[model samples]
Target: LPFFPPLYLGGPEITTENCEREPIHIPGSIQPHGALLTADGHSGEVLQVSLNAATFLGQEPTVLRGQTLAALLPEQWPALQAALLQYRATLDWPAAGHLSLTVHRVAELLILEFEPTHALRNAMFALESAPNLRALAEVATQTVRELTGFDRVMLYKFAPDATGEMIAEARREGMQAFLGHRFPASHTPAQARALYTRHLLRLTADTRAAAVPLDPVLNPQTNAPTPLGGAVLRATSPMHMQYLRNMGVGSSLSVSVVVGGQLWGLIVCHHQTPYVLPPDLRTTLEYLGRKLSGQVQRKEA
Candidate 1:
């Protein structure tokens, strides 16, 4: 029920015609499945955290806030500092035997997130060991389904005009097969396509859940919407929500497949019921998507 105030004082109702161009990059809220920490760039002191951080951190935001990163991650603190000094925007660390840690910088704030990656080592081997693109796609989806519990997974490729077709699919019994079905270009507009190039993974944890709103709405200093393009918690556009509902999809995840730095396709997963993919499994999904991209290009060559 927690949501940000409307960006516009009283904006027009959202429609498909205008939805693709919507500034969804700065949704001001995050999905509930993961936690985010905003810390001081220079001091490494925690400044802010997502309301749900308690679920993962096992501590309330109040308790975690104002604490230094070194206090939270003693082992990784040194490497984190070096990454910051090198001006790296993203860095990863093995925080625990099963957890994969990631750090991202947005302006003067450092965003840190952690997820589990223990099972992904074996999954990664499966995709890497596949002999052909078809087998790669098949195992990729099957591995993704095993990791995330999604009911269906499809290797959705985009045509030059932006229309999408399912080249391969893995789904549960009695489910419909989307293979060979072509979606119109309007389904993914130019702007959305560009976003996919930059963001390799897109997850809609729940179609029916109301999106949480950014509490302050705008950055107090900049007087602008928080730039959340790289955030995992970014909310979905209303138009996209309606589109998913029309398809009877309650939860969906899309992992981009890039070839030669271009958006080639997506590994799309759909669930019949609402499901919040754990942040850890999402890391593994991204790895598979990246590996699949290479095989796709090889097959084309």
Candidate 2:
């Protein structure tokens, strides 16, 4: 709503103009596909929650706030405490209608993210490993499209100048194509590129759903918006949502390909019809991205 600037100015090539300057890490909201909550590191008292916490947890943030984890999710508290020792872990929450949960910590707080589980086992389609980068990319696209069910999937590579070209592709029957098409570098700004190297995937599942705001917005201790770039379900940038609509798509996801400490490309998917990727499938597709990146890095050298 207001003029924007990059939140992390110290980073290399961080964007500072127009849509390129959008602050994505601290959108102050989370996607409706999952619920997010932060709790005290020592006592496990709920500190902050996204508004949609009720959708996944069956309790509103107001009611859950300040409540001890034991009181809110008594059945999960013990297992959750065990997960805290590892700093991050995933497990099915049998206590909450069998949803799958991902948990991790930051400083003195622990973040709990929950996603609905899949009924089907993860019998993922196996990728036929390839020797060349292009063939590997093609293998990746086909396997990812089948597993993730995106309408179109392609390897959008960045040239030396940062402009993107969709090099290899797989699409559903009757869907349009973007192979070999050149797109502006603005589509993938410096900040996003920097993030891709650290975070393997980013999904904007539904532009139609409203962002669920954090209960208190600013972090209680810092008095500033919390950094959620590492969060899988962080809210999609408002500018990016409009951009997807402009391109005639309702949903999308990007699996980053970073090789040798630089972002080389993105395994991007676009859906003309609305589609949501289940949590297990997301982890699988991200595996494809990392594999593709390794294959590409090997062949390039």
lDDT of 2 by residue, 1-301 (tens): 3325433333223332565556777777889888898777778888889988888878888998889988877776787777672233354554765676677776777778887772122222233347677777787788778777888999899999999999999998987678999988888777778878877888888877788888877677666666777788899877678788888888899999888989999989999866778877777776667767777887888
Q: Give the per-residue lDDT digits (tens) of candidate 1, residues 1-301.
A: 1223345534455465554556667766666656666667778787666676666667778888778988987766777777861222222343333544567777876767644435767887887788887888788878887887889998888888788899888888898788789998777766667788887888788888776544445544356666676776677777787789889999988998988878888888898888878655676777778777777777767
Give the C-alpha lDDT of model 1: 0.72
lDDT of every model, 2 decimals: 0.72, 0.77
RMSD to the hidden true structure, all candidates: 5.4, 4.6
Clashing pairs in 1: 3-213, 4-213, 30-233, 31-233, 116-280
The true-versus-predicted C-alpha distance at residue 143 of model 2, in Å, is 0.8
Looking at model 1, residue 291 earns an lDDT score of 74
Error of 1 at 43 (Å): 3.4
lDDT of 1 at 57: 67
How many clashing pairs does model 2 include? 0
Model 1 misplaced regions, further than 4 Å: 1-13, 45-79, 85-101, 114-135
